Amino acid sequence: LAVSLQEALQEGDTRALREVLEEIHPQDLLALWDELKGEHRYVVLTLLPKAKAAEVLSHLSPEEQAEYLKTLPPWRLREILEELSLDDLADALQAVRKEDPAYFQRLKDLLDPRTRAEVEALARYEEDEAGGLMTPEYVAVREGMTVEEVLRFLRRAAPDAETIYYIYVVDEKGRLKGVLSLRDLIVADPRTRVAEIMNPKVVYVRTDTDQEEVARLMADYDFTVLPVVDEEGRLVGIVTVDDVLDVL
Amino acid sequence: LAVSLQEALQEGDTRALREVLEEIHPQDLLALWDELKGEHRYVVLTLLPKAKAAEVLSHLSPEEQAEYLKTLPPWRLREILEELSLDDLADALQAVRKEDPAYFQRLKDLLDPRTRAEVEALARYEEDEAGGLMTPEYVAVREGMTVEEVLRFLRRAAPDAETIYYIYVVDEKGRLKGVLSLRDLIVADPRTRVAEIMNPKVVYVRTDTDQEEVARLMADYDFTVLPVVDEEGRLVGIVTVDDVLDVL
Amino acid sequence: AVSLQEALQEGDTRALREVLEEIHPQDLLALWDELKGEHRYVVLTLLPKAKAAEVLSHLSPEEQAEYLKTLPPWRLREILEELSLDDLADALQAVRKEDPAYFQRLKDLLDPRTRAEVEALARYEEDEAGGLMTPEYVAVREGMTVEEVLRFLRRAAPDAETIYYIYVVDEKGRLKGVLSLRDLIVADPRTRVAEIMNPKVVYVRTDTDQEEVARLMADYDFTVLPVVDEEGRLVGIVTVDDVLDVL
Amino acid sequence: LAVSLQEALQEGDTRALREVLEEIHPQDLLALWDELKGEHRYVVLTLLPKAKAAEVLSHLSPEEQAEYLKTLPPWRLREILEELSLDDLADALQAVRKEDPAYFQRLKDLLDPRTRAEVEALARYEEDEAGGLMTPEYVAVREGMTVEEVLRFLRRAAPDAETIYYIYVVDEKGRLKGVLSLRDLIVADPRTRVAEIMNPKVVYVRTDTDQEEVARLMADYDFTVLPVVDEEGRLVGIVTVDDVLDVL
Ligand SMILES: Nc1ncnc2c1ncn2[C@@H]1O[C@H](COP(=O)(O)OP(=O)(O)OP(=O)(O)O)[C@@H](O)[C@H]1O
Ligand SMILES: Nc1ncnc2c1ncn2[C@@H]1O[C@H](COP(=O)(O)OP(=O)(O)OP(=O)(O)O)[C@@H](O)[C@H]1O
Ligand SMILES: Nc1ncnc2c1ncn2[C@@H]1O[C@H](COP(=O)(O)OP(=O)(O)OP(=O)(O)O)[C@@H](O)[C@H]1O
Ligand SMILES: Nc1ncnc2c1ncn2[C@@H]1O[C@H](COP(=O)(O)OP(=O)(O)OP(=O)(O)O)[C@@H](O)[C@H]1O
Ligand SMILES: [Mg+2]
Ligand SMILES: [Mg+2]
Ligand SMILES: [Mg+2]
Ligand SMILES: [Mg+2]
Ligand SMILES: [Mg+2]
Ligand SMILES: [Mg+2]
Ligand SMILES: [Mg+2]
Ligand SMILES: [Mg+2]
């Protein structure tokens, strides 16, 4: 299959190339990523579907992340940057700023105003603490909602959430008050209020919490996702376990 | 023509395309503007000579104005920003802050100090009043100047003036005192003083004045340009009829 | 002229420094592009800062920008701090036309007040009064007596653009009268300014066109002209040398 | 030796000088600092390796700090600002703000967002209290970690830590609960938990504590570092004695 794109690569006509790419897996593209030359990398990135383009970008080394964000054509930029999970977006920009603070500024200029807001908050954190690892794309609900309401909410919180298997519950002020699983929603009666299904003794993590402490906590409680809070006890993000394996 | 453009786009060769853009009229490009795909618009705006690029921009909707002031490359920005007439520059910046005040701020930073000085003044007026429509790029002279001197002045005022067919006359304090046309000047004797050709009975409009009042007034007296004064009677700008036709 | 080149052959600081300290800026200005990067670099290396600045104020905007990029940064703040504010603005503008990043850097090098001062001037049209004026004039109050004004002028002199014309403002700084150095000298040392000053002052607005400044300058046969803002406050003076230079 | 430096300045030739700068100690450079003229200091700062360049800046008077942050070329600025310890960077930026608030602002723009985040936090505290002296670059751990885990932890905490000879202990909420020394970790069993080596009897100082008290307290208990907490008991920084010796 590596030759299969190169077959399509050499073919010069995109149409053959576009049908392989739409079924190539990111990781299988990631593996063969560095036997590819500038013109190749350029064209595959010219119209690799934006979800996949973004996905590959996230798994490259910071050096190559920066290189690729100076490679792709600018009409493609806002797409890819807007497709990135915010955690991955921050990492990408930090990678960029390390070599080119000017371009870092340029990139952020491209963002939708809310997205820039979001990333700018995340970027303020130490890359190797919870904040530097978290993403704000989680599902939060309040105590009074019933299970039915929570499900209807999750099915449109779904397009953009990092994960929906864990639903966090905060109050009026947005401070953490409980945690609930998708599995829990399912076993329970649709009009059960969340307040008796939620677990009130939530294990949480601070934005300055060291990543290996996050890793230990994750291995101890055997959770794949962990909530992150600010000084006021407010849920500000979640750290997913995949992003913790990557610190090894 | 239309085919002349699309051919050049697909060929990828900037030869055919710079050849098309340097002779295409902005309005013919504006007409086909939303038969264009993201990469196309980028490329036309990357290589359309700056005066036309600015021309198109002024005729896009505020929404696309904001968007394309974000797609274009930064070296192109300061050009387009400096190439806009000050009324249109103000409009464009307003369109941007409506969506993205962060980027609104970064843009103004790109402006030269005179332009930021100038634009910030206009930005202070209500967009549907005389100030929201005026430009400071008008030509003013004193009553004592001779037709010969006024004419020599026009030839170095022209590059930047909105219009030079009407010449406005102010005093020591710069408050409005008279008006004369380029035609009155040509009909007149080269050593004739302005104070004797000018019309002292000038119809003016205040920054306060609602845009439709600018329209009724423009239509009655059949002027294509109308002067704006402040509360102390000082000329601060002129409103031309084209910007008033565009109020529909 | 070769007297320069002999100093070149010397390779010597002193041999070159001795001619540079007695060369007139205009005589340096004439042969300036009989000089190569190597020459201009070294002449600028230790040419006395006042003169260095003087030459700079008189180069074409393209070469000014170049000149501000050749000299070593320890010399930059010197030369920049020596420029009259009118000339400093013009120099930075020249730079920004080609390189806005460097324009930003230069301004970073300024003393905070000089930056403030230049930044005000930079907002004006290069060909209107504000673009031509310099804020380095002498202002006094109406109640001062002649001796007091002279005292001021003797320490106002080092930095003032000119001291031959003294302008009179009030508590809030609106123009009140104009006075000459000559008037001060013919006059009695305890005479108050308010009886010697001329109250009907001819002024120019910051948006006033430069050729109107030239006419006014030629009509009233003045060499310096005061510039005011919209509130009637003296904000600068335009000297006639800078108006001849528009021709 | 010391005189060998002036040789290289006079050499005009860079290589002779880079050899000197590469082995001169900051203090030996600081000693001779104002027998130097502008052209020299510039060149010494043009070519002095960034840790040393930052070291010298840090021991200069606030006035020369402010000055030399203006003489150095901007490509060096971002280096030196990022190379400073956070306590010193906060001190240096204040030195600049006292003379030139405009430039004070531009510098902060050069800062990386986490660095700006951190420094802005330190800037809020009074220069003559614990906050004005502390640095957040300390190492904190949990009670449950073993001696083994911490020792592994310190080997990736050290590069940025002010000091690692004292390791501090906080809880779920990050409030101070205990202290232990690096020697305590080394003597102890690799499987021993921190909660059993740590001294729960911690001597602390709040952010508003006057410097003289930090000195009084440091001299009594014969400590070289002292922890700082907020009003809710959360560890926010450490004060080292070298910054207390330099209060004279
Ligand atoms: N951050 C958290 N803090 C506290 N409890 C949590 C947190 N995240 C999830 N939980 C709890 O963990 C459980 C979710 O586990 P899941 O439903 O995946 O089943 P599991 O891993 O097989 O274990 P079990 O079936 O025993 O719950 C729920 O009880 C949920 O309340
Ligand atoms: N805003 C204004 N207020 C008052 N008077 C004006 C204004 N604008 C123009 N005028 C006067 O009206 C006249 C219109 O002159 P213009 O150059 O438009 O000639 P025209 O319309 O081609 O010929 P005509 O005016 O004789 O029909 C000008 O000479 C000017 O003096
Ligand atoms: N900008 C100005 N506006 C109005 N009056 C001025 C201005 N500048 C100078 N004057 C006045 O005009 C006169 C010029 O005197 P100056 O020092 O030029 O000697 P002069 O050329 O012989 O003039 P005079 O013959 O009038 O004395 C002085 O009285 C001065 O106060
Ligand atoms: N800030 C502090 N507050 C309270 N206790 C502290 C603090 N810092 C250190 N300690 C305790 O004081 C002890 C002294 O530290 P350290 O081991 O460096 O001492 P030492 O001089 O090497 O040997 P000794 O402790 O025998 O004098 C540490 O073991 C630690 O438990
Ligand atoms: Mg990260
Ligand atoms: Mg993730
Ligand atoms: Mg408008
Ligand atoms: Mg217009
Ligand atoms: Mg000027
Ligand atoms: Mg001058
Ligand atoms: Mg401090
Ligand atoms: Mg310290």
Residue numbers in the entry:
A (entry chain D), B (entry chain B), D (entry chain A): 5 to 252
C (entry chain C): 6 to 252
Task: Give the published text.
The bacterial MgtE channels are highly selective for Mg2+, and are involved in the maintenance of the intracellular Mg2+ concentration. The full-length structure in the presence of Mg2+ revealed that MgtE forms a homodimer, consisting of five transmembrane helices, one plug helix, and the cytosolic region composed of the N-terminal domain and the tandemly repeated CBS domains.
We also determined the crystal structure of the cytosolic domain of MgtE in complex with ATP at 3.0 Å resolution. The overall structure of the cytosolic domain is essentially identical to that in the full-length MgtE structure in complex with ATP, with an RMSD value of 0.9 Å for 230 Cα atoms. ATP molecules are located proximal to the subunit interface between the N domain in one subunit and the CBS domain in the neighboring subunit. Therefore, ATP binding to MgtE may not be directly coupled with Mg2+ binding. The ribose moiety of ATP forms two hydrogen bonds with the side chain of Asp188, while the α- and β-phosphates of ATP interact with the side chains of Tyr170 and Arg187, respectively. The phosphate groups of ATP adopt the extended conformation, and thus the three phosphate groups are exposed to the subunit interface between the N and CBS domains.
